[PDB]
Amino acid sequence: GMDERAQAALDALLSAKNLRDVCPETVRRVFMELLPRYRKPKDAEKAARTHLHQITGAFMTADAQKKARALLARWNEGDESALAAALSLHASTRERLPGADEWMRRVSPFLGADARVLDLACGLNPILLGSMGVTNALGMDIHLGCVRLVNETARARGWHTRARACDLLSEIPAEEADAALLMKLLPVLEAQKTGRAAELLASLRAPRLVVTFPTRTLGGRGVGMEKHYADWFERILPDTLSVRDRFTVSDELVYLVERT
Amino acid sequence: GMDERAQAALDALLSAKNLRDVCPETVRRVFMELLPRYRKPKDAEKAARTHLHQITGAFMTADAQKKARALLARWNEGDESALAAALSLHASTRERLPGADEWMRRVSPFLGADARVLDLACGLNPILLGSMGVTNALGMDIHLGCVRLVNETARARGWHTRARACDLLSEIPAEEADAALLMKLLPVLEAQKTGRAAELLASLRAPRLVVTFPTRTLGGRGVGMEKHYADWFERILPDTLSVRDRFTVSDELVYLVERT
Numbered sequence: 105g106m107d108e109r110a111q112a113a114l115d116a117l118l119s120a121k122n123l124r125d126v127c128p129e130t131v132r133r134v135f136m137e138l139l140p141r142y143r144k145p146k147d148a149e150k151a152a153r154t155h156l157h158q159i160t161g162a163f164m165t166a167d168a169q170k171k172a173r174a175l176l177a178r179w180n181e182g183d184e185s186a187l188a189a190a191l192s193l194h195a196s197t198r199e200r201l202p203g204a205d206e207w208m209r210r211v212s213p214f215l216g217a218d219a220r221v222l223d224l225a226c227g228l229n230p231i232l233l234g235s236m237g238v239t240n241a242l243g244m245d246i247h248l249g250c251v252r253l254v255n256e257t258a259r260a261r262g263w264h265t266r267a268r269a270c271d272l273l274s275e276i277p278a279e280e281a282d283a284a285l286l287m288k289l290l291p292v293l294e295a296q297k298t299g300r301a302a303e304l305l306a307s308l309r310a311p312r313l314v315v316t317f318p319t320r321t322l323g324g325r326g327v328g329m330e331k332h333y334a335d336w337f338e339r340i341l342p343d344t345l346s347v348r349d350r351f352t353v354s355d356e357l358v359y360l361v362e363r364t
Numbered sequence: 365g366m367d368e369r370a371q372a373a374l375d376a377l378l379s380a381k382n383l384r385d386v387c388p389e390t391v392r393r394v395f396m397e398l399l400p401r402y403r404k405p406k407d408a409e410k411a412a413r414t415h416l417h418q419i420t421g422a423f424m425t426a427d428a429q430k431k432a433r434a435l436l437a438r439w440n441e442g443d444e445s446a447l448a449a450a451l452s453l454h455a456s457t458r459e460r461l462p463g464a465d466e467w468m469r470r471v472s473p474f475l476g477a478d479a480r481v482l483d484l485a486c487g488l489n490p491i492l493l494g495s496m497g498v499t500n501a502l503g504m505d506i507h508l509g510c511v512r513l514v515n516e517t518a519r520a521r522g523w524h525t526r527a528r529a530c531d532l533l534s535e536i537p538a539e540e541a542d543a544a545l546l547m548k549l550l551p552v553l554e555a556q557k558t559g560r561a562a563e564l565l566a567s568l569r570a571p572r573l574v575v576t577f578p579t580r581t582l583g584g585r586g587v588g589m590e591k592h593y594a595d596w597f598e599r600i601l602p603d604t605l606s607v608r609d610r611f612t613v614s615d616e617l618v619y620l621v622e623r624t
């Protein structure tokens with residue numbers, strides 16, 4: 105069985121306001137992976153909180169989610185167009201908003217007309233996509249707040265797009281699709297389990313993949329993250345896959361990848 | 365002069381709740397660096413918001429700051445010891461809490477007894493330090509919320525420690541000290557201006573430096589960030605400085621650096 109003081113620490117994690125919208129099985133998995141590394145379960149709890157913030161919490165806060173909820177409601181009015189204002193509330197979509205036009209111009213012909221699109225670790229990106237005519241996507245994420253907002257917005261707009269819970273460390277999505285998006289995802293997945301990026305890429309049942317990385321440059325060249333991600337990606341990419349194209353849009357390094 | 369629509373976009377940034385505690389000169393500098401790269405000043409505004417979130421906002425939210433305020437008040441009662449609970453509210457200090465004992469055991473003999481310590485881009489770290497007997501530090505940061513909390517806590521505890529506003533892209537701190545801490549700082553500084561890390565290290569007026577990097581590992585080895593930071597650091601380190609020691613504590617790669 106489980107130690108009682110360990111369960112109290114896990115309980116503090118599971119009842120935390122900040123984690124209320126993370127998949128509980130993910131919270132538990134992270135904590136149990138860390139629990140054998142600290143003598144004090146309260147130290148495992150702090151370590152799990154940090155881990156969970158790094159992999160999902162930092163992109164969107166708890167009350168910015170209710171704020172995003174109310175903004176997207178004003179967008180379906182068709183007056184406000186605070187659609188930009190809502191998508192600005194998740195760190196990964198706000199990063200993409202200023203280059204979104206360039207991004208769709210350069211990526212959408214790869215996806216194909218009316219493609220069935222899987223958006224893996226989707227955050228709020230399926231709302232951005234859907235606004236730009238890509239309305240047949242299936243998002244998935246461990247952040248049930250993201251999932252909920254996507255489904256609500258899609259049903260209100262008449263999109264076929266939907267989202268569902270998914271922890272990519274314990275599930276390789278089995279859906280069929282024309283394309284899958286792995287945007288700003290592989291580094292944080294590989295941080296959670298060595299080899300997991302290559303295992304995911306080799307097993308997805310979509311012939312075209314869009315894989316992207318953040319270039320954490322902000323006017324200076326930084327420590328060279330873009331080249332480091334590129335080298336790593338080219339080294340782990342399964343031999344069954346081939347890069348069709350590479351380019352950088354608004355501090356996002358984008359790869360168009362084809363199944364050979 | 366400045367374009368009026370550009371100033372309206374800057375004004376939206378300067379009046380934003382999320383930025384209310386960032387140094388205004390820093391907000392303006394970031395926006396003016398980006399303003400010549402977008403045709404629409406509202407796109408420069410979104411880009412500046414993203415930049416500013418990456419360099420300072422993501423570590424601590426706006427209301428977690430009032431929460432930290434109320435927790436630290438209960439700690440000076442000497443009953444609650446929610447000191448751990450407050451320091452858990454800034455991402456960089458919560459990362460360090462579980463290894464803090466190991467961290468002080470391994471770093472403090474380098475600082476020296478009753479050292480005068482500069483804490484550059486200090487976040488809430490001077491409160492963590494001060495609790496552990498390092499009570500003569502001068503923190504500095506662009507986050508005036510951090511600065512305010514540090515000064516309030518220090519005066520209530522009787523510490524000599526203080527903090528002040530400082531933008532490390534436009535100022536090389538001129539203070540004299542026994543040691544300076546550059547913790548989880550050089551990558552984000554170098555992302556803002558190429559060469560700025562080496563210029564800062566070569567000009568600080570302290571004979572001992574503690575320089576640290578996040579190892580963004582979470583159970584998997586990720587893309588190899590630790591080795592990448594190590595290689596970069598060894599390449600940019602000014603020849604007037606020498607690494608005395610290196611070790612990793614709680615996903616922080618730590619260098620003890622001596623002026624030769």
Ligand SMILES: Nc1ncnc2c1ncn2[C@@H]1O[C@H](CSCC[C@H](N)C(=O)O)[C@@H](O)[C@H]1O
Pocket residue numbers: 159160163196197224225226227228229244245246247250270271272273286287288289292293296
């Ligand atoms: N193990 C995991 N399984 C599923 N999603 C995960 C995950 N680890 C992190 N995530 C999700 O990965 C996302 C990283 S931010 C990238 C979001 C989106 N692809 C975009 O580019 O806009 C977060 O939404 C987080 O919830």
Ligand SMILES: Nc1ncnc2c1ncn2[C@@H]1O[C@H](CSCC[C@H](N)C(=O)O)[C@@H](O)[C@H]1O
Pocket residue numbers: 419420423456457484485486487488489504505506507510530531532533546547548549552553556
């Ligand atoms: N140009 C700049 N000048 C001063 N501080 C900066 C800065 N860019 C980012 N920062 C600060 O750098 C910090 C990075 S988080 C690291 C905080 C602290 N050293 C610790 O390890 O706990 C944030 O507090 C942010 O406010």
